[PDB]
């Protein structure tokens, strides 16, 4: 965890903790979702978020919960560092079959089935290994941009 | 002689990167220049070889060899006459005003005789040549002899 | 020591000296660490901080201890002054090999091994000598930002 990433989680903690007392309760979760447009947010969704913690969601409990789910989270500059080492001549997005072979043949984390899931929402270019960069974006901030 | 100038020994401690009080033979040319001596690089080369000293293989030094080599180079400072430096560049460009066109002095200083890198040539023209492309060598040789 | 840097150390001395009597004892160290989230701060860490002084930690003993550890501490504006002289055309971060050659060939403090340690937590850009500015930040205030 770099310090600017921890400051981003402190700002997200303050936007969900609308009572500003330092502990995100279930009313803060529901009022942050209603301010984003969720008028139908069920109480069972709020209870499942609170069921991931052993205590009240203060800043260090929110940081330890996000730490334990993001144990391989990598910032965009280090993902582009590794993709610039995979394309060491610069500019070009690397081939689809080169990333499939190098993921498998180096590591067990790069096994195929997982490579079909990589192509599956990370579209073609991303999946193929040709573009580059959009995948670093969606690994640090999810969903389609 | 001491006039025993003990600041030459204190400057040898500023150029020795290992702190063991030895200076390699490849640094001796530039440190003679930093002590106020301008021997040409062929002269520094000859003297070395003259004494069956090879600058091609690893070298160390001791103060007891560097002191007499600086004292053998110190007699040759009578060759530094500024009349001939300004008259050299006055024969290098026409008309009665001391201006070399930029690229004439840069290509001559890099390729004629003892090769000066173009990085060092740009660092010696930086400030004395303005955007007209004309180097006034009356002030240029004055500032080169200020160091 | 510029006077605003001494006022920053006076403010840090007042935040660690929670009894406000002018001398930081071991209880102040433990209660400042507990207010930052350190519930497990051992007494041996507090004793090692007090073992760096010959007397009680008043404001001048805290300033002399920080002076003797920060004998080459440079403010961010003077580090950016020197990096603007290394990049005299402005804007561009300077090359990796140019900073390695100029550190070594000018001074003994710029020797290589030390240059590998510079690249080692000061990441690539910083290490390489291309970016600039993030290294001035972390030299005046440590850890990842």
From Swiss-Prot, chains A, C:
Molecular function per GO: calcium ion binding
Cellular-component GO terms for this entry: cytoplasm; myosin complex
Source organism superkingdom: Eukaryota
EF-hand domain mapped to chain residues: 9-39, 74-109, 110-144
Binding positions (Ca(2+)): 17, 19, 21, 28
Swiss-Prot/TrEMBL keywords: Calcium, Metal-binding, Methylation, Motor protein, Muscle protein, Myosin, Phosphoprotein, Repeat
Effect of residue 83 to L: Results in 50% reduction in actin filament velocity
Processing and modification events after translation: The N-terminus is blocked. N,N,N-trimethylalanine, found in other myosin light chains would not have been detected in the N-terminal tryptic peptide in PubMed:7358336 because it would remain trimethylated and ninhydrin negative after hydrolysis.
Gene Ontology BP terms: muscle contraction; skeletal muscle tissue development
Subunit field text: Myosin is a hexamer of 2 heavy chains and 4 light chains.
Additional comment: This chain binds calcium.
Task of the protein: Myosin regulatory subunit that plays an essential to maintain muscle integrity during early development. Plays a role in muscle contraction.
Name of protein: Myosin regulatory light chain 11
Species, as recorded: Gallus gallus
Gene responsible for this protein: MYL11
Curated annotation (Swiss-Prot), chain B:
InterPro entries with a match to the protein in the record: CALM/Myosin/TropC-like, EF-hand-dom_pair, EF_hand_dom
Keyword terms of this UniProt record: Motor protein, Muscle protein, Myosin, Repeat
One GO cellular component term noted in the UniProt record for this chain: myosin II complex
Keyword Repeat: yes
Keyword Repeat listed: yes
Domain EF-hand: 7-38, 41-76, 80-115, 115-147
Top-level taxonomic group: Eukaryota
Record field: transmembrane: none
Gene Ontology terms, MF aspect: calcium ion binding
PTM comment: The N-terminus is blocked.
PANTHER family: MYOSIN LIGHT CHAIN 1, 3 (PTHR23048), MYOSIN LIGHT CHAIN 1_3, SKELETAL MUSCLE ISOFORM (PTHR23048:SF3)
Subunit-structure text: Myosin is a hexamer of 2 heavy chains and 4 light chains.
Name of this protein: Myosin light chain 3, skeletal muscle isoform
